[PDB]
Structures are given as C-alpha cells and as structure tokens.
C-alpha cells in the first residue's frame, strides 16, 4: 500500500480555525478509529501543485475556490460524488463556485468578503469614501493614532479599490472569461492604485505594512481602521477594541468591489483515501456541529450550509460581509488565476515602494497576467522558486559547479520546458547562446526585493563581482542594508547583494 493510505492529512491556511477543525477531526477519529492530522504549512497554495502530483501531498486541501480550477484542470483534484439529498443542504450558488467544466471539484464551505473594520471609541462614524481617509489621518495623527492599516503584500486586500473605478481581472464575455482581455491596465485600475500609492507618499501608510503588523496595530488600538475578512474577528474580540464591521469605502462615488471567495475543500486525486475524505467532509464538517466548531475558533463568514446559516444570518457582521459581497464580483477559477495573482502582487508591491511607476507596474502586470509560467524543481524556505516566465532571469546549469545567468525566451509543455539564452556574445551568436533545459537545470533569480535572509552557514550560489557566473559560496552573515557577506569556495570576504545570492541545489540534494 501507499504511505498516505490508512489515514487523513489536512492542509489549511494558518489564519483559519485549524484548532477548531482539529476538533471536528477528533469527533471523526473517535467514531472511525482513523487518525486525522491537520496542518497549516507556509505557502501551501504553491506547494500543493508540486507535491500532490508526485502522488504524495495532503488528502484534503482548503483554499478559496479561485485556485481550485487550476488544480482540477491539471488533474490534481478528484471529481467529488455527493448525492442529491446532500447537494440540497448547500446553497445552490456555492456549488456554482466549485464547478469546473460542469464537474463538481470541491465541497464549498463559506462565503467570505473583506469589510471595513473600525474602532467605535476612536471613530463613532466611519468614512464612506476613500477620499476622506487622507483628512481622517491628519486628524488622528495629532493624538498619535493612524487612520488606516492593512496588508499591502497581498493583492487581495488592495483589489477592492483597484476595481471600484473600473479595474477588473478577466472579462466575462460569451459563456466565458477571455484571458485575452485583462483589465488591470485600464484607467479604471490605474486610478485606484495611483490613489493607494499617494496615500503612502503622503505618509498615511507605510509600504512595509504586512498582515501581522496591521492586525496588531488594530488590536492594540493604534489605528482607527483596517480591511480584513471574517476570520480576523476572533482576535479582535479577545482584545479591547470595541469594533464594528461595515461596507468598504467608496472611490470616485463607486463602491469598492472586493473579490468574493468561497472557502472550499478539495480531495487530492492521487490520494488512496478519497472515500474516507468524503466521510469526513459530508458527515462531520459540513454539519451543524462541525461548522459551529470551526466557526468558534475563527469565524468562517457566511456558511454554505443552509440550516446553520440561519444562525449567523442575523449577525450584523455577516450582514456587512454580504453587503460588500453583493457589491463586488465572484473570483473566476480559470487556470490563469495563479499567473494573474503573481502579476498583480508584483505590481502592487513595486508601485507602492517607488521601484516602479504605476504605469510601469500595471503595464507589465497585464503582460504577465495571462502568461504561461513554470517553476524550478529546487525550492527554499528563503527564496521563491516561481513564477518563471518569458522575460525572467535565471541561473542555468550547463550540461557540459558553475551556473550561468540566462534570460527566458520560451516556457513550454506546461512549464516543464524552457529555452534560455546567455546574453553575452558567443561564437555561434553575438545575441547570446541558446540552450534547452528542464526544471532542474535552473534557479529563479527573483526580480523583486528580497524578503528573508539566509542563516549563517547556508550554502548558496552567488554571482561573483564582474561576472555573469554564479559560483558556490558559504554565507557568513547578512549586512543590515540586506547585503550578504560571503566566503567563495576556492578563492577579504566578499559582499554580494542579496538579489544575487540564490539557494544551493547541490546542498538541497
């Protein structure tokens, strides 16, 4: 039998009620004797596609419905098999969200949407427009408080604003979404981000604000507002803030259009426990007690289960959540969604940090929102390995331990194949020599700013000063400005900018 056979392994994002779900798992373990293990790994959304297929990976995966279409398309999720008596217990529209090519590809759980969360003691009346925020912050600054603070590292949070005035993702054309019609480069979109960029220029927000930093700012009462979803209410209650939840601010007289997502559970197609996974989902989780339990840890939002939604239905927070949901649009689920998210995330972090003008970021964002991309076989907790698309820069390991820097000209066969070119003039071409490689012959050189440093002792491939070659090296320490101090093998110590210090594939063996 396969190693995964005989038990269940669940994956869920770290901001949901995985402890409340562990409870649902205990009731199940008890009734069947089978073991259930709940995990909340980092960047699970990117690891699932690389480990699920090797025939391994978790048995159940929880994420917003937007990424499920790509998994189903690639054959990583199995077609679920609920009868009609069960299909009736869920809201017909939540089933619509997890359908791909007329096939049900996952069990829906809840409808979640971002709302404006505010402090009542600090702000008895919240602004209705974004344009009131710049003045609201000047007023609040005199008392040592800020007006707004939310995650600027994840595009999902800024999207509501980028969409209010006309920005969209993919156009819903005939009976479908035209991937040839991206709307992240139109004036509607540019006007929203430009407004966001200005808020930062005028010191109303700092581009370093991430998720953790904002949550604390609001829970300690350092800021009057924040834009988050239902799952965040658990921590606020635990704190002191006397808060409220209402509609998002308008922009240019238009409502903020938050992308609406349906948390959903998928069943891995490689799994030998598809039938134990169904038992768990239909009889234990999607039950009044099963949801009530997960809802208790961290609020789920508007639940797909009709009978239990009758409870939260009257809750004002759910009311606001559904209000904003009705004003926004439901995320698509085509395979191009992950490429799309990588492009916008790249454009938002860049425009906000000055590294790129709004025009430049969004223009490129439109160029890579539909692009086919691949990922490197070598992964690292310190450096991203995707997405590798045309125009990307990488470290290539010639068949002929030196790695040369190359540009990517073509991604083919679903990202399992590339055609890279060395830009330095070669005997066969002054434009550069071209090679064909698979996923193990290269490492992605992240184009954006670095996020994590390498612990001292880490083996890496750094580009040597005045060369286009990456040589083996050992990390001594990281200089504050970010820069890595390194001892190069077979030669003072050498200082190389972090952007040129990649993980070692050899060490990763």
């Amino acid at each position: 039998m396969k190693i995964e056979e005989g038990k269940l392994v669940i994956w869920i994002n770290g901001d949901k009620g995985y402890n409340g779900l562990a409870e649902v798992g205990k009731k199940f373990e008890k009734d069947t004797g089978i073991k259930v293990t709940v995990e909340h790994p980092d960047k699970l959304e990117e690891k699932f596609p690389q480990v699920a297929a090797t025939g391994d990976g978790p048995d159940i995966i929880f994420w917003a419905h937007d990424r499920f279409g790509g998994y189903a398309q690639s054959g990583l999720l199995a077609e679920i098999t609920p009868d009609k008596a069960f299909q009736d217990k869920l809201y017909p529209f939540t089933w619509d969200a997890v359908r791909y090519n007329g096939k049900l590809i996952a069990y829906p759980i809840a409808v979640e949407a971002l709302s404006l969360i505010y402090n009542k003691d600090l702000l008895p009346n919240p602004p209705k427009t974004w344009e009131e925020i710049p003045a609201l912050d000047k007023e609040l600054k005199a008392k040592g408080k800020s007006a707004l603070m939310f995650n600027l590292q994840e595009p999902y949070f800024t999207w509501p604003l980028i969409a209010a005035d006309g920005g969209y993702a993919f156009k819903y054309e005939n009976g479908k979404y035209d991937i040839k019609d991206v709307g992240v480069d139109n004036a509607g979109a540019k006007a929203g981000l430009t407004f966001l960029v200005d808020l930062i220029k005028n010191k109303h927000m700092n581009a370093d604000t991430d998720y953790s930093i904002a949550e604390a700012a609001f829970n300690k009462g350092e800021t009057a507002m924040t834009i988050n979803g239902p799952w965040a209410w658990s921590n606020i209650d635990t704190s002191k803030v006397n808060y409220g939840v209402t509609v998002l601010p308008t922009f240019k007289g238009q409502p903020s259009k938050p992308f609406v997502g349906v948390l959903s559970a998928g069943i891995n197609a490689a799994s030998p426990n598809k039938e134990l996974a169904k038992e768990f989902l239909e009889n234990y989780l999607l039950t009044d007690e099963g949801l009530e339990a997960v809802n208790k840890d961290k609020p789920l939002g508007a639940v797909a289960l009709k009978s239990y939604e009758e409870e939260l239905a009257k809750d004002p927070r759910i009311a606001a959540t559904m209000e904003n949901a009705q004003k926004g649009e439901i995320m698509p689920n085509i395979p191009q969604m992950s490429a799309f998210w990588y492009a916008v995330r790249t454009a938002v972090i860049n425009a906000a940090s000055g590294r790129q003008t709004v025009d430049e970021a969004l223009a490129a964002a439109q160029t890579n929102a539909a692009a086919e991309f691949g990922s490197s076989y070598w992964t690292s907790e310190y450096n991203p390995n995707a997405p590798i698309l045309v125009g990307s820069e990488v470290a290539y390991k010639p068949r002929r331990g030196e790695w040369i820097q190359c540009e990517v000209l073509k991604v083919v066969a679903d990202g399992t194949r590339f055609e890279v070119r060395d830009p330095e003039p070669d005997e066969l071409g002054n434009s550069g020599k071209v090679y064909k490689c698979n996923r193990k012959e290269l490492l992605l050189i992240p184009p954006g700013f670095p996020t994590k440093n390498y612990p001292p002792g880490t083996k890496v491939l750094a580009r040597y000063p005045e060369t286009t070659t990456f040589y083996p090296a050992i990390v001594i320490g990281t200089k504050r400005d970010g820069t890595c101090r390194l001892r190069f093998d077979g030669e003072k110590e050498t200082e190389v900018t972090r952007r040129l210090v990649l993980p070692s594939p050899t060490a990763l063996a």
Binding site: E424, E466, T467, T468, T469, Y471
Partner: peptide
C-alpha cells in the same frame, strides 16, 4: 558568460 580570474 563572463567568468572569474
């Protein structure tokens, strides 16, 4: 590619 030494 450009090399060392």
């Amino acid at each position: 590619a450009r090399t060392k030494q």
